[PDB]
From a paper:
Dihydropteroate synthase (DHPS, EC: 2.5.1.15) catalyses the reaction of 6-hydroxymethyl-7,8-dihydropterin-pyrophosphate with p-aminobenzoic acid (p-ABA) to yield 7,8-dihydropteroate and pyrophosphate. In so doing the enzyme supports the biosynthesis of folate, a key metabolite required to support the synthesis of DNA, and proteins. BcDHPS displays a triosephosphate isomerase (TIM)-barrel fold, consisting of eight parallel β-strands surrounded by eight α-helices. The DHPS active site is formed entirely within a single subunit.
The structure of BcDHPS complexed with 7,8-dihydropteroate was refined to 1.95 Å resolution. The crystals for the complex structure display space group P212121 and there are two molecules, labeled A and B, in the asymmetric unit. Here, the product of the enzyme reaction, 7,8-dihydropteroate is ordered, placed with the pterin directed down into the barrel with the p-ABA moiety pointing out towards the surface of the protein. The ligand possesses nine functional groups of which eight participate in direct hydrogen bonds with DHPS. Four hydrogen bond donors, N2, N3, N8 and N14 interact with functional groups on Asn120, Asp191, Asp101 and Thr68 respectively. On the other side of the pterin, O4 and N5 accept hydrogen bonds donated from Lys233 NZ. A carboxylate oxygen, on the p-ABA moiety, accepts hydrogen bonds donated from the main chain amide and side chain hydroxyl groups of Ser234. The pterin is sandwiched between a cluster of hydrophobic residues (Ile122, Met144 and Phe196) on one side and the guanidinium group of Arg268 on the other (data not shown). Modeling of loop 2, linking β2 to α2 was possible only in the case of the product complex. We were fortunate that the product complex of BcDHPS allowed us to model loop 2 and the complete structure we obtained provides an improved template suited for in silico screening.
Author numbering:
A (entry chain B): 2 to 31, 42 to 292
B (entry chain A): 3 to 31, 42 to 292
The structure:
């Protein structure tokens, strides 16, 4: 406060964060026209980016075969490109990264932090945005591991610092990179996730210009929320998800990744109005 | 971490380790529909219930005394056994008198105990008292056009005078909370959002040096519609949650809301964040 996240080069777009941006989650997982209507609705509700995922990229989910992931993701990229809204791709598979970038996606959002063999090579060229997330696990297994940290905030920051360095060593400009602490990925459901949310600014390492890498935060409908509201199921977590998104932007998040776009946008309109009033004092 | 000063509140001593949620119980048509609503809001996590028999809002037509009493008193009598603080949203001294005699715990007055006879009605006993700021003329009960130097300072100075008037009549400072009165004589965005941004500065000091605890009510109000493209009241729930969270972040003791479950859930997240912060 009154913090300004560093800019993100994001394929066709140069994102700046005078206000935090809302990334609407477009799960392309049961048809195509169903997903396109969803995307149009989310844009109408105020989504600033769309995150296209052909898999369940969460802990304990079945891993989708390559041909099918390609068949879900690529035609949505092609159909949504004309809308001139950033298209993020939720994938850790280098082949999906290559095909999706060739199809004209703007951002690669990777739960494995570009650790899968060949992912860095897939993304090093061009201008796409890249979100390196923290997940505790061994990449070869494709499985999230058990929580284990000294200070989870420090460990998450150092890992993200190493991932940004690895991207930069391969020629990726620092301005194309954002980071994400990976809420719900190898974290104690309450203690680790809320430590990371309370200390969000400190999860982000510094770019060479001294500015912190901008932060993407995704908590929407997650177990960390169910755990504090008496165990209600995902569809009953909207108000809690709005609360978490607001907390993240209060703590300097550049982008919030959400299911409930209208509700998040409305909440962020109120947040911006408060900030605008505070700036006159 | 801010800890709002405690509120002596009739049968209850309220302390604010966490902010409390006051559920709005609009008792306007019946006297039984209101009761199931109250039970639901308690089940959803309401810490207080605000019983209102009128429209205590700018431009709203008034309800005659005997009708307001017919709506409020049976509800006080019916809800007392539930053992949750009962607040009465009234500016009428006769309703204040009758509600306290029926056993209400808190009097919530949009006129800041300015109506003739109000202070005299609430002097005695241990009821909590919420003195709200509204810019207007008590005699005609008309809200005024916004007019402030620094609205934050003007609101605080008014609330200091109302607290002092209550104390001059023998009211213990511990019984008093204050409310900047969002949407009552305020520029819809300029003034309301200044007050929310500078919320802790709207409360004057008690004699012990702690600020009077703050009640804030923004649920579904125009200030919210104004910033979300002019959506109507029933479509302001997400914006109302954001406002409540902002208010507690800025030290509010009680938030007054229509959407109890949604607000309680948001505050559960907020509490979890604070608890994590306190371990660092
Ligand atoms: N950059 C980025 N990408 C994602 C994220 C995320 O948080 N950040 N979350 C995702 C959803 N995965 C889940 C993880 C945990 C939970 C849960 O805790 O319930 C649910 C879903 C997938 N893709
Ligand atoms: N202590 C306290 N009591 C109240 C309050 C309130 O904000 N604080 N609001 C009330 C509802 N009045 C409205 C005022 C403004 C608006 C609006 O701006 O839309 C709507 C309703 C009545 N009772
Ligand atoms: Cl835990
Ligand atoms: Cl205005």
């Amino acid at each position: 406060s009154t913090f300004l996240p560093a800019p993100l080069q994001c394929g066709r777009f140069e994102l700046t964060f005078e206000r935090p941006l809302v990334m609407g989650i477009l799960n392309a997982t049961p048809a195509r026209d169903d997903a396109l209507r969803r995307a149009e609705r989310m844009i109408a509700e105020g989504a600033d980016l769309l995150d296209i995922g052909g898999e369940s990229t969460r802990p304990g989910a079945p891993p989708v075969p390559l041909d099918e992931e390609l068949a879900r993701v690529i035609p949505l990229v092609e159909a949504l490109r004309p809308l001139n809204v950033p298209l993020s791709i939720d994938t850790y598979k280098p082949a999906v990264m290559r095909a999706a970038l060739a199809a004209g996606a703007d951002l690669i959002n990777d739960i494995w932090g570009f650790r899968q063999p060949g992912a860095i090579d897939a993304v090093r060229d061009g201008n796409s945005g890249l979100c390196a997330m923290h997940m505790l696990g061994e990449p070869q297994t494709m499985q999230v591991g058990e929580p284990d940290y000294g200070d989870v905030v420090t460990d998450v920051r150092d890992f993200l610092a190493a991932r940004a360095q690895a991207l930069r060593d391969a020629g990726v400009a620092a301005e194309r990179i954002c980071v994400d602490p990976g809420f719900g990925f190898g974290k104690a459901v309450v203690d680790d996730n809320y430590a990371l949310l309370a200390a969000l600014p400190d999860t982000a390492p510094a770019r060479p210009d001294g500015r912190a890498y901008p932060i993407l935060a995704g908590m929407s409908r997650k177990s960390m929320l169910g755990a504090v509201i008496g165990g209600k199921p995902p569809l009953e977590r909207v108000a809690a998800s709005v609360a978490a998104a607001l907390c993240a932007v209060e703590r300097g998040a550049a982008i919030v990744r959400v299911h409930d776009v209208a509700a998040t946008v409305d909440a962020l309109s109120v947040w911006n109005a408060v900030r605008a009033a505070a700036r006159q004092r």
